[PDB]
Amino acid sequence: SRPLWLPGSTPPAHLKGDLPGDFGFDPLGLGANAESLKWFKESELVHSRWAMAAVAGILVQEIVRPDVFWYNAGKEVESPLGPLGLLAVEFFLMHWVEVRRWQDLRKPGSVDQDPIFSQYKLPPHEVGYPGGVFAPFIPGDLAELKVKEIKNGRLAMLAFVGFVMAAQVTGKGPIAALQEHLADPWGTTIFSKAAVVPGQAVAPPCKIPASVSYKGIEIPTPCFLQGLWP
Amino acid sequence: KRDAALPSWMPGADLPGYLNGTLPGDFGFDPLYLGQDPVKLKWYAQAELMNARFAMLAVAGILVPELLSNIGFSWPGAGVAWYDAGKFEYFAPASSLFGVQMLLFAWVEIRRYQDFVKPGSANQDPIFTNNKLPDGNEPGYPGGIFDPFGWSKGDIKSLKLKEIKNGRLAMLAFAGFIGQAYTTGTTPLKNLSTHLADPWSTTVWQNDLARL
Amino acid sequence: RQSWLPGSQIPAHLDTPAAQALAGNFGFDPLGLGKDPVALRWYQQAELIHCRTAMAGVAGILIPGLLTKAGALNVPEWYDAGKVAIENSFAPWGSLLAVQLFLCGFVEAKRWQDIRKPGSQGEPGSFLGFEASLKGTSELGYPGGPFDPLGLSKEADKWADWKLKEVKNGRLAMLAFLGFVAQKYATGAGPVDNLAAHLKDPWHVNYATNGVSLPFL
Amino acid sequence: VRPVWFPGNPPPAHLDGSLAGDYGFDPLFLGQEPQTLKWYVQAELVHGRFAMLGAAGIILTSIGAKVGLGFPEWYDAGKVVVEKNNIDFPTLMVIQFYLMGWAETKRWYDFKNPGSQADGSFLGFTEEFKGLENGYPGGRFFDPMGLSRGDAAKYQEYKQKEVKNGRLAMIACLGFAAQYAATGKGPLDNLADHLADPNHVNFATNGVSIPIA
Numbered sequence A: 001s002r003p004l005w006l007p008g009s010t011p012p013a014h015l016k017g018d019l020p021g022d023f024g025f026d027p028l029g030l031g032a033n034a035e036s037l038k039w040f041k042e043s044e045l046v047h048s049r050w051a052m053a054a055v056a057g058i059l060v061q062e063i064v065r066p067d068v069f070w071y072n073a074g075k076e077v078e079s080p081l082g083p084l085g086l087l088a089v090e091f092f093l094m095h096w097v098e099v100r101r102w103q104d105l106r107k108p109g110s111v112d113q114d115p116i117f118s119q120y121k122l123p124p125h126e127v128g129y130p131g132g133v134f135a136p137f138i139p140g141d142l143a144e145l146k147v148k149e150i151k152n153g154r155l156a157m158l159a160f161v162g163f164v165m166a167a168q169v170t171g172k173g174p175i176a177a178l179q180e181h182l183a184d185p186w187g188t189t190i191f192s193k194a195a196v197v198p199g200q201a202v203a204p205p206c207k208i209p210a211s212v213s214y215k216g217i218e219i220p221t222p223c224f225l226q227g228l229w230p
Numbered sequence B: 001k002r003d004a005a006l007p008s009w010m011p012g013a014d015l016p017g018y019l020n021g022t023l024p025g026d027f028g029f030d031p032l033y034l035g036q037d038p039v040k041l042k043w044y045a046q047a048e049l050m051n052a053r054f055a056m057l058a059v060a061g062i063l064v065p066e067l068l069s070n071i072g073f074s075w076p077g078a079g080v081a082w083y084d085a086g087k088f089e090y091f092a093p094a095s096s097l098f099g100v101q102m103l104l105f106a107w108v109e110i111r112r113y114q115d116f117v118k119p120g121s122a123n124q125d126p127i128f129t130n131n132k133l134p135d136g137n138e139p140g141y142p143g144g145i146f147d148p149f150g151w152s153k154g155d156i157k158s159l160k161l162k163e164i165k166n167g168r169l170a171m172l173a174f175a176g177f178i179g180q181a182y183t184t185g186t187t188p189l190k191n192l193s194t195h196l197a198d199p200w201s202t203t204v205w206q207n208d209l210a211r212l
Numbered sequence C: 001r002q003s004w005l006p007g008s009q010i011p012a013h014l015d016t017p018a019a020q021a022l023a024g025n026f027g028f029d030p031l032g033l034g035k036d037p038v039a040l041r042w043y044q045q046a047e048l049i050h051c052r053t054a055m056a057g058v059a060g061i062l063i064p065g066l067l068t069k070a071g072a073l074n075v076p077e078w079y080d081a082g083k084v085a086i087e088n089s090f091a092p093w094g095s096l097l098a099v100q101l102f103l104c105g106f107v108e109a110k111r112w113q114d115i116r117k118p119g120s121q122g123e124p125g126s127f128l129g130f131e132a133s134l135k136g137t138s139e140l141g142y143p144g145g146p147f148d149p150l151g152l153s154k155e156a157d158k159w160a161d162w163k164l165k166e167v168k169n170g171r172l173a174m175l176a177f178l179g180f181v182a183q184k185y186a187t188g189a190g191p192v193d194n195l196a197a198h199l200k201d202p203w204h205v206n207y208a209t210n211g212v213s214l215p216f217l
Numbered sequence D: 001v002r003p004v005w006f007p008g009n010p011p012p013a014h015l016d017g018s019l020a021g022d023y024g025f026d027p028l029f030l031g032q033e034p035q036t037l038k039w040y041v042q043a044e045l046v047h048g049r050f051a052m053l054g055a056a057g058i059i060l061t062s063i064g065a066k067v068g069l070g071f072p073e074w075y076d077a078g079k080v081v082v083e084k085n086n087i088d089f090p091t092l093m094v095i096q097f098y099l100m101g102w103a104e105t106k107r108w109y110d111f112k113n114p115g116s117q118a119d120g121s122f123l124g125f126t127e128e129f130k131g132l133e134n135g136y137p138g139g140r141f142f143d144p145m146g147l148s149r150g151d152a153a154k155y156q157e158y159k160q161k162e163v164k165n166g167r168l169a170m171i172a173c174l175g176f177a178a179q180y181a182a183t184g185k186g187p188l189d190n191l192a193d194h195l196a197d198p199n200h201v202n203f204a205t206n207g208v209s210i211p212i213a
């Protein structure tokens, strides 16, 4: 009745197209339990929204600041607030925001009220889609926009993973890595730099230093699952 | 089971029913269920008031003396840290002061305890028998001579909430004095000046990591 | 029903109404020592006396030890105090102990006769008018009367909770004294010295590294 | 009708095919008594799940050592960890039996008295320790994703996979011990040597397994 991830297949029973972005993909049956699916549905949106901002953020950083590698931006950035001053502010602000989001998930409607100003409240809403002040402008139908959000979100989640593994394998940002592919497309793919055959395994070298010195301490910087690289 | 109209320490949470809102400052906070038993809750309510009122006097007795010294006011006790007041030389030895203290506090504390056991039974002066507190007082809120200006005749419910709120904040402040003095080795207002001088590099994380 | 071992079969003799009325009944009697009701009554008295003596003894070791470390007092180690005290004493330990046996024996005998015939020490004329105060209460092991000056036991709503606190702290005190004896031989230091040494380096200073407790390792 | 370990031989009466991995294999009749069989079913699952963890841990670290990431061999890891990190062996050993003793004893008394650990005695937790079946705890803590709380048919398939992968891991761990004793090398050194010359580097030529050769 609806397009599927694998055309011609039959979606699992627990998937019926109610959710946006429901293309009948759950081969392991992780979402069969209703309670689990509610938590996983919330988690997918959060991962997707974080990934979309991060992928957009990384791309703009490279264009605006091509001289700084996004993978190194943690140590290269110097601000007066210092390391622990920034972390302390981030911890408390994120703890408040995340606990309130969490409470809505457990008990929907219980954190729609503004704690300080008694006249402001979020109108009733679905979990994961807090309207009101968070949605001043809605260009069109929500149902269509929800599909657009999750599809772009699932693409940005894969894009970030592509940035991480490309950075560790090439040591270059997403745009610089792309230009390397375009210069020599036949000699720049992962197949062109790695291969395993019976009796020999060749893997690229991790282009990230094993450790980073930062303000008098050493921060380990290991490549992700390097021993399992092709 | 707790009424949903009452304010909550954690909006949306389901809180115990025995904290029905009669006591002042009832926000339903009891994650360890210490006050579940009504008999113990009665004692804890008084203990919270007693520790709260001594903490408020103690905190005010540690900041104002230090604030006055910083301003420039001069008096023999000026410039002495609250944790060095014991060694200071007074008109009498500290041992004799302690002895007088316990005798005086035995009288007033046993008078207060008598009211808690049997409210209204300690409202009369034992020497000048004419003097007496009003018969309507409750344990923890004597009134009468203890409320000469009659503030208790106004919005008592709000005033009790203000008292416990300031009291709970004062109790945390005194706990901060012990922790801050033990780790920084300086007076509380000197610690505040250090934080205001450079807030971003003077957090407890910065300070304790250096001492680590 | 609280149990020392959730899911185990509670002994039948600890599930009777009489046994469940004892303070600290968590169904713990693997050896079946208290299976006989008469024996359980006697062992309940023994546990209370051990509890109260251990609490006083452990408090007499731990509080002076903590104050000695803080400098408020100067008391020797609990295992050296007997020698230090006797040197500055007015009597040899033999005469001191003999008097103790006479005085302790007298009060212990009166308690003993009360266990056999509860309330019997109130026999008129036996004591010089004081026997009226020696009848005890309805519960064996809780004499009350002159033994409860503040009258805390008269509060019925708090009686069960008071008894549970006494037995719980008493059982803890007994294990603490057994810990003092074992730690004295294993480490050759004081109880507070052992606590400080553990806190200084918990992962390398404990009983697995004292060279005595675990010889196979 | 179901496939059996020895085609043609009828399965024994006490193996009726309900349990996962039931192939009628019990030639010594060790699980004939139903109460003994329940205990053995859990013993096989505990062995299998520990072997699966051990096989995956040995394999991963062996790969790291092979590709020169600095990992020790599984038969050398114990010495390297304590010496490198300055860890007292007896202290680590004692902590292990405290934590395993607590978890194992609670598992032990759920077998003796099912559902007895769900009364709330442990920190007030009730449902997470109720248990679902003999050897299959379930619940939010042991099954956070609730894969046993969804499709029943899917759940039965996972049980078949778990025990079969568990039996294979148990055999593999036996292989690691036997191969280390025979060759003195790591599992992937053995695999690499076999692949280089399969016909001439195998157990028949290691000088130990076939002494008469």
Ligand code: CHL
Binding pocket: A070, A071, A072, A073, A074, A075, A076, A086, A087, A090, A091, A094, A212, A214, A219, A220, A221, A222
């Ligand atoms: C989404 C979060 C996030 C991610 C994915 C990264 C990713 C990265 N950072 Mg960055 N950082 C992140 C947040 C932050 N970083 C920094 C500060 C730094 C520094 C100073 C450095 C990096 C570096 C790196 C890189 C390598 C780090 C590594 O391998 O560490 C291995 C792992 C660890 C060292 C610890 C892992 C901790 C654990 C996964 C999470 C712990 C969670 C907390 C307990 C939660 C409580 C705190 C609050 C705030 C949430 C990598 C690109 C390094 C770099 O540039 O290398 C070239 C580097 O030097 N980051 C801050 C402080 C403002 C962050 C705040 O959120």
Ligand code: CHL
Binding pocket: B082, B083, B084, B085, B086, B087, B094, B095, B097, B098, B101, C072
């Ligand atoms: C709320 C109750 C309360 C609290 C929290 C404190 C807290 C403190 N008093 Mg204080 N006192 C309190 C009530 C009282 N004190 C005293 C009398 C004293 C004295 C006389 C002294 C203190 C000192 C101390 C400190 C102990 C730590 C230390 O430096 O040890 C190490 C101890 C020393 C370096 C002091 C050595 C010289 C001292 C003359 C030896 C004899 C001290 C006594 C044994 C103190 C007994 C205090 C008891 C009765 C509360 C600490 C800041 C000491 C201080 O200020 O040290 C800087 C101190 O000397 N207090 C009295 C009697 C009026 C109290 C009555 O309630």
Ligand code: CLA
Binding pocket: A049, A050, A053, A054, A056, A057, A058, A060, A061, A064, A065, A068, A073, A074, A076, A077
């Ligand atoms: C996931 C989010 C994220 C994170 C963690 C970072 C992190 C970083 N960015 Mg990046 N960035 C992001 C998103 C993100 N960015 C996005 C979406 C954009 C596009 C607009 C950019 C554009 C950008 C540029 C152009 C630059 C960085 C730079 C930096 C670095 C220094 C930051 C700084 O100095 O802040 C200082 C902070 C302030 C002065 C105040 C900022 C207040 C903002 C605007 C409020 C935002 C509110 C919003 C609702 C938050 C949503 C969060 C999330 C849910 C998406 C740091 C590594 C700099 C860099 O590379 O330095 C080496 C740099 O030049 N970022």
Ligand code: CLA
Binding pocket: B169, B172, B173, B175, B176, B177, B179, B180, B183, B184, B191, B192, B194, B195, B202, B203, B204, B205, B207, B208
């Ligand atoms: C009554 C609340 C209160 C206040 C206003 C302060 C204020 C301060 N503390 Mg103190 N502190 C407190 C309680 C408080 N503390 C308590 C209860 C403890 C015992 C654990 C400590 C232990 C402590 C240490 C060990 C240190 C400080 C330090 C500091 C400074 C800030 C930097 C820092 O690391 O803070 C960390 C403070 C905390 C984690 C306290 C958290 C608990 C309080 C009650 C939170 C209240 C939040 C609430 C919204 C109200 C806050 C605002 C209001 C008062 C206007 C600053 C002078 C540092 C310093 O001296 O720097 C020079 C420092 O090293 N405090």
Ligand SMILES: CC(/C=C/C=C(C)/C=C/[C@@]12O[C@]1(C)C[C@@H](O)CC2(C)C)=C\C=C\C=C(C)\C=C\C=C(C)\C=C\[C@@]12O[C@]1(C)C[C@@H](O)CC2(C)C
Binding pocket: C028, C029, C030, C031, C032, C033, C050, C053, C054, C056, C057, C058, C060, C061, C077, C078, C079, C080, C081, C082, C174, C175, C177, C178
């Ligand atoms: C009384 C006591 C200690 C008294 C100590 C005193 C007076 C100390 C006094 C002094 O220290 C001072 C103050 C100061 C020092 O300078 C001098 C001395 C003189 C040294 C300890 C009892 C200590 C008693 C102990 C430890 C008893 C433990 C019993 C256990 C574990 C029984 C278990 C079971 O019996 C059950 C319950 C049920 C069965 O089915 C199963 C089993 C297992 C058999």
